[PDB]
Amino acid sequence: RVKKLINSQISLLIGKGLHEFDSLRDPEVNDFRTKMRQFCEEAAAHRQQLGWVEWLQYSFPLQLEPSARNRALLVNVKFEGSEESFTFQVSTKDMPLALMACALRKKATVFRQPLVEQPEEYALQVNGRHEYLYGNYPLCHFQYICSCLHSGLTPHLTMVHSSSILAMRDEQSNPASLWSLEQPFSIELIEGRKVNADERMKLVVQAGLFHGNEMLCKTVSSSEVNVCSEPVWKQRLEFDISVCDLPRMARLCFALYAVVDCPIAWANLMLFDYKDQLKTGERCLYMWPSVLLNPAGTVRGNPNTESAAALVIYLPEVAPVYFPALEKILELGRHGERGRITEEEQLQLREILERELYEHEKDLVWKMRHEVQEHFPEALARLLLVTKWNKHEDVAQMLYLLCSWPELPVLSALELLDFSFPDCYVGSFAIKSLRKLTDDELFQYLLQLVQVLKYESYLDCELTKFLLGRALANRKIGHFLFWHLRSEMHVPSVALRFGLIMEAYCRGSTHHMKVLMKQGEALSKLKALNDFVKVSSQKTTKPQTKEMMHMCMRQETYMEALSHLQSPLDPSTLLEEVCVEQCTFMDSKMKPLWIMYSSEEAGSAGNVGIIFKNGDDLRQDMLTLQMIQLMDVLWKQEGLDLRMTPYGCLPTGDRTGLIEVVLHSDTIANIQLNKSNMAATAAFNKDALLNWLKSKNPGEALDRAIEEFTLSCAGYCVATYVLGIGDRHSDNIMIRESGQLFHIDFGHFLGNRERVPFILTYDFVHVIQQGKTNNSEKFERFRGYCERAYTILRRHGLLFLHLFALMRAAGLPELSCSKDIQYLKDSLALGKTEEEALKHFRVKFNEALRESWKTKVN
Ligand SMILES: COc1ncc(C2=CCOCC2)cc1S(=O)(=O)Nc1cncc(C#CCN2CCN(C(C)C)CC2)c1
Structure with a gap:
């Protein structure tokens, strides 16, 4: 009764019916499902008996500052079922326990009773989030407490008792011999099916044995046979390698093509099966369409059997021969x-x-x-x-x-x-x-x-x-x-x-x-709503389409599907009440939707937004953003905070994904429009960015806003240089009201193929120099921030190279060869000493300053 429901919910969530797994009738597929179901059920049962602090580590894992792996601080603490709150001044050096014991002494006087409950029985929840503060860590080590110190804001925390955490645990429960065959390895290329090619040409089948990227022996070719739907060979292809020398992970790679070089299809298979047995009998290889031999490609056939070209091959019987134990x-x-x-x-x-x-x-x-x-x-x-x-x-x-x-x-x-x-x-x-x-x-x-x-x-x-x-x-x-x-x-x-x-x-x-089905439901409604927006925008004006969007969002199905969910960008962020009136969309080709949210329980931290995008592939934006985030983590571990803005980006389906809204931020282009009758209107366009910062940060606040800009600017100058992110313009660079600069739209990286130089923009140099033409004290502090950041990344050069090497598997057009990885090797100067790499960086930086001054001359 429940299994039917669960199997149907899984099918809906994964976007594929579980019946299709059974319909394949593959023992490997069934044995993965039975073995992995047992392994995953053992993990679920283990979890249901976890201690209440171990349940917090599973559900709400700590979010600590990279350096954690004195100063006054005003905290607001309330209790789970309460309306009243307590505001007390604690220190950034104190641990959650002291703050919880302080909240219990404030509550013992308010309720006139010596409390039985000790601080050890509680955890501190961040208000309106799936985030908790717990463990022996000083307050400033937590990411929530640290971000509150920068933004000026006061942490709002809730005392949750162990009994309530245990009640969540329970509510979330799962329902109740090879080496003696020295003969040469060979196969028989029988025929081909559903083949499409120019009839003037001839078909050729190239085959080779691989152990990853290396050939185990030289490649072999078939006899040339006239182009047609069903080509027939019936011939032995003999490779020079003993059947006994075939390594366990050997794969036989195929490539059919036409010749007078016209590629048609490829297919690979493992010579041994999943149960370690050598393969014998006939195999039908449902080929994948090309653009010659592709070893990294999958060893499983094209599931589209009604249209795929199929090579028919015979694996001869060498005697049941398994790979030796x-x-x-x-x-x-x-x-x-x-x-x-x-x-x-x-x-x-x-x-x-x-x-x-x-x-x-x-x-x-x-x-x-x-x-x-x-x-x-x-x-x-x-x-x-x-x-x-x-x-x-x-x-x-x-x-x-x-x-x-x-x-x-x-x-x-x-x-x-x-x-x-x-x-x-x-x-x-x-x-x-x-x-x-x-x-x-x-x-x-x-x-x-x-x-x-x-x-x-x-x-x-x-x-x-x-x-x-x-x-x-x-x-x-x-x-x-x-x-x-x-x-x-x-x-x-x-x-x-x-x-x-x-x-x-x-x-x-x-x-x-x-929980994830509730997210998938919201993304369905967002696809339909985005589709309506795309249609309505090519007929009526933006105000009319925006109100039609709002009317559609205001339907019960939309209000129910889009509210009270965990953000796919961040499970700690709860998207509670969608603020329809604040929702909108951008004017670019794919009309990305901006969905605004709020929560009375979270206060200011509940005012969040998400951007639904459908039409563009977001994999490379995500990868670039993650690399930038890795940089910020590495800089912070050496004591260098460059005020980075690593916002979330997550593909969720076919050319579909979500970007996290960074509120109180505009593009350089929008600030530089120099609109009349604003708090920022200037006599010279060169002033607009600096006037906008002044308007947002009055009097003494300007000084810190200029330093936030300098620091983040230095971080992004280095990050975009190392990653070869070019095509940088005023509409893909944003600035926060706090002074923080950041980049958006990462369609191009790794120089893809020009060599992206270091970029220094006069507009940003003008802000760094506090509005002055000559300010070497401020400018050279910035060249130092750039040099520290660059030299810290070079020391982790091999971590970026290894990570980018693994990423070649993603099939990203700008990340599929050694030329792309070579780009990072050059940008990080990994073939040089630190002194020599720093001299080369200074020469790149000095060349960028000279280029910046071609705009400063005029
Ligand atoms: C590549 O796509 C994106 N990447 C990151 C962001 C991110 C944008 C900011 O957060 C970080 C990520 C947003 C987009 S987008 O799909 O929205 N496209 C886009 C392009 N170029 C510029 C923008 C603006 C802008 C400025 N905003 C001013 C306030 N406005 C309000 C009143 C609705 C919306 C537009 C928006």
């Missing part, structure tokens, strides 16, 4: 010769492991494999790349050393997740080194780890199991894992994989399924 492998690898040559050979080893290498260096690194294991364990990735994956004796010797390799730092593990390391044991070892990842680090890299699933050869994998277990133990990780997979359900290549992961997650959290 790890004990057989470790026995074979247990025998070898160790490294034993002079300190002059070890000097060459030490030089090449601390600096792409020549063939004699590969023979040196492999010979000294035992010494790299014990004296340079972090060089595992170099050694794995020199390993001959096309010789089974060499794979067993490598796996023997890997099986007792010490756990590596997170930075090294993020490299091992790359597609250039397709061995399952290597991936398993990499995941083992990532378990020590804090929920905050995991969240930071969650987008990349989701893309790595696209490289996975099989459905059931250590990465999937790891991502699902971290999602079920932290509701914020769960929320974003769901949205990263949900937003890709319109992509045929990942819909099966992602749909199965979301169904499994849903088995672990039935309550959270209902």
